[PDB]
Design a protein around this ligand. Structure first.
Ligand SMILES: C[C@H]1O[C@H](O[C@H]2[C@H](O)[C@@H](O)[C@@H](O[C@H]3[C@H](O)[C@@H](O)[C@@H](O)O[C@@H]3CO)O[C@@H]2CO)[C@H](O)[C@@H](O)[C@@H]1N[C@H]1C=C(CO)[C@@H](O)[C@H](O)[C@H]1O
Ligand SMILES: C[C@H]1O[C@H](O[C@H]2[C@H](O)[C@@H](O)[C@@H](O[C@H]3[C@H](O)[C@@H](O)[C@@H](O)O[C@@H]3CO)O[C@@H]2CO)[C@H](O)[C@@H](O)[C@@H]1N[C@H]1C=C(CO)[C@@H](O)[C@H](O)[C@H]1O
Ligand SMILES: Nc1ncnc2c1ncn2[C@@H]1O[C@H](COP(=O)(O)OP(=O)(O)NP(=O)(O)O)[C@@H](O)[C@H]1O
Ligand SMILES: Nc1ncnc2c1ncn2[C@@H]1O[C@H](COP(=O)(O)OP(=O)(O)NP(=O)(O)O)[C@@H](O)[C@H]1O
Ligand SMILES: [Mn+2]
Ligand SMILES: [Mn+2]
Lengths: 299, 306
């Protein structure tokens, strides 16, 4: 209802976390695992929580289900002080089963669940856009038009492409359409070439590549080479689950860049918080606050 | 930690322990691919696990079942609860902080299953026998699922002169965990899967336990029934159902057990019941993991005539 700093569009669901000895899975008919937790998650949700956790004002706009999980999300967001605007789809809330090893390897078994061709009433995101400084668009299929609207409304825009080929046409609208572009180095064949293209064919102001344990890479039009942002080791806090890490990174970065306009400072800030999300198990269970950030950012 | 739920009438089969929740994920193929993210069709969340299987199968066969287990104060715990009220099945339970059992089942378009099982209860946890003792009094037969605490339910059930049965599932024949169930129950079911010296284990069970007979289930190869009297196992042909091809062998053992019991309680024919269980198990193979479907009396009797 009120002004928000970051509007997140889409990307809230439910995650089922199974801790396994190692990946690829053994050859068995039945294997016993430690407790399988069920948490609210998915990329958009991560960013929103992270922003809110940093004292800033976030807000959600997504398609959830008339599920039990839809309602879990609903008053989970009411538990925190986070505005959520949703429409319910018959097909139900997105959810996923994530396999995690005790050393960090992650595989995600993802259930988008919504009709690929489905578009919610644009008022879903359009009202958010009027009351928001920045818009983070998560790569739900319909969310592309939110980005379209957001840019047209002269809001700063961001997106997370996640694993993306660097080739596929699906992600492309987000890659070329958003001001600040985040993507995981995971499936990138020619990062150099992919970045260069985005700069050429899109309104990408800069491109931040997240590469797990080896940190993150920041690309600028001005620099032919990426600025390398080393991963942060937290004194007292070891890595447990790198799920929600990207979203946490993004959350910190945005919050920092919205205030300072320093791109590297924000990248450093994102490296923290990204690292903080690793000290906890379970996607989007723990986020860094302001006080904790500034202490570690002096470090 | 004092039992509650709904239980008032006489029951044919009391199932002790073994109810939980399954998360079913349909996968392209197994062994799992090497990737960071792949999309799958809708992941359904259904009530399941071994005890639940027996109880449901019995219920589907026109007889009266009933549950006694440890569930959680979970959402999944409450899922189970009014799933059992949807059907006409009495459940009596105690709640543990650690929550309801769960499992993640990976299933292929070919039938292949991997189960990631979460017992969740403290291994050393024992509910107050009042959980199952009222059940035992209002029941003709007691099926004990190999939950660790269920160990004493069986003992109590036996002392109450009820006929008893259990499903040991995978068992090498060496572990001491299963032994109390193996030696303590009247009708013993075990999967041939991890049995190294099947013969010797049986001989032992008969010798050191009160096993009246032992039913070895061997998937696609049918089932073997052992008696003290015959030195060789009687082989029960796997049954092919007309109109219903094999698609998913998930739930077959529990289904086998339910049908067997219901038949043996009525007729006392062991080979006859064994044949019925073969049908019940085959029906579960005709079922896809996501649908809960058990054979009724009519289909059973028809196919048992064939
Ligand atoms: C957020 C999500 O992003 C990625 O998923 C996207 C796919 O990569 C896209 O290809 C597209 O999938 C569509 C396919 O083209 C096609 O199958 C069509 O039928 O519809 C599909 C659904 O639209 O869109 C997907 C997003 O909707 C990525 O692969 C996936 O891993 C990402 N989800 C993870 C995010 C987090 C936290 O950041 C975890 O909590 C989730 O469990 C992960 O699943
Ligand atoms: C029903 C379940 O039975 C079997 O699981 C038992 C284990 O084989 C036992 O060794 C014992 O495990 C305990 C360990 O001994 C102990 O050291 C500690 O690790 O705690 C363990 C849990 O108490 O007891 C287990 C039963 O509590 C079998 O291995 C397992 O596969 C069986 N579950 C299947 C049954 C169904 C439906 O028929 C599915 O829903 C499950 O996903 C299957 O896994
Ligand atoms: N082991 C680690 N040690 C320190 N920092 C880490 C570690 N793993 C990840 N990070 C930080 O967290 C960020 C996110 O990691 P990464 O796994 O690359 O994102 P991601 O794979 O896209 N996660 P997701 O958004 O769910 O797809 C990285 O860019 C680092 O800044
Ligand atoms: N592929 C199959 N085709 C036909 N009948 C089958 C097939 N698999 C199993 N059966 C029947 O179903 C019974 C159960 O077999 P089995 O898979 O060993 O039980 P299980 O291992 O306990 N599976 P579960 O129900 O999860 O405990 C067998 O004894 C057969 O009678
Ligand atoms: Mn990501
Ligand atoms: Mn079994």
């Amino acid at each position: 209802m009120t002004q928000a700093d970051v509007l997140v569009v889409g990307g809230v669901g439910v995650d089922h976390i199974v801790r396994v000895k190692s990946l690829p899975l053994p050859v068995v008919d039945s294997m016993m695992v430690p407790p399988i937790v069920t948490v609210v998650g998915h990329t958009g949700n991560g960013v929103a929580l992270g922003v809110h956790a940093l004292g800033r004002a976030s807000a959600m706009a997504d398609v959830i289900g008339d599920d039990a999980e839809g309602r879990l999300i609903q008053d989970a967001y009411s538990a925190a002080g986070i505005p959520i605007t949703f429409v319910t789809h018959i097909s139900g809330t997105r959810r996923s089963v994530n396999l995690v090893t005790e050393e960090g390897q992650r595989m995600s078994l993802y259930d988008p669940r919504h009709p690929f061709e489905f578009i919610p009433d644009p008022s879903l995101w359009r009202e958010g856009i009027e009351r928001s400084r920045h818009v983070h668009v998560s790569i739900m299929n319909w969310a592309r038009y939110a980005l379209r609207d957001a840019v047209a409304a002269g809001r700063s825009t961001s997106t997370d492409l996640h694993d993306w080929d660097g080739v596929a046409d699906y992600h492309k609208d987000f890659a070329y359409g958003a001001d600040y572009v985040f993507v995981s180095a995971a499936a990138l064949r020619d990062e150099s070439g992919v970045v260069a293209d985005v700069f050429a064919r899109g309104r990408a102001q800069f491109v931040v590549v997240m590469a797990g344990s080896e940190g993150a890479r920041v690309w600028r039009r001005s620099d032919e080479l990426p600025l390398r942002i080393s991963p942060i080791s937290i004194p007292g806090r070891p890595v447990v689950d790198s799920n929600g890490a990207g979203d946490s990174f993004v959350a910190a970065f945005l919050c920092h860049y919205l205030d300072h306009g320093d791109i590297f400072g924000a990248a450093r800030a994102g490296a923290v918080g990204g690292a903080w999300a690793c000290g906890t198990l379970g996607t989007h269970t723990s986020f860094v606050d302001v006080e904790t950030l500034e202490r570690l950012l002096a470090r």
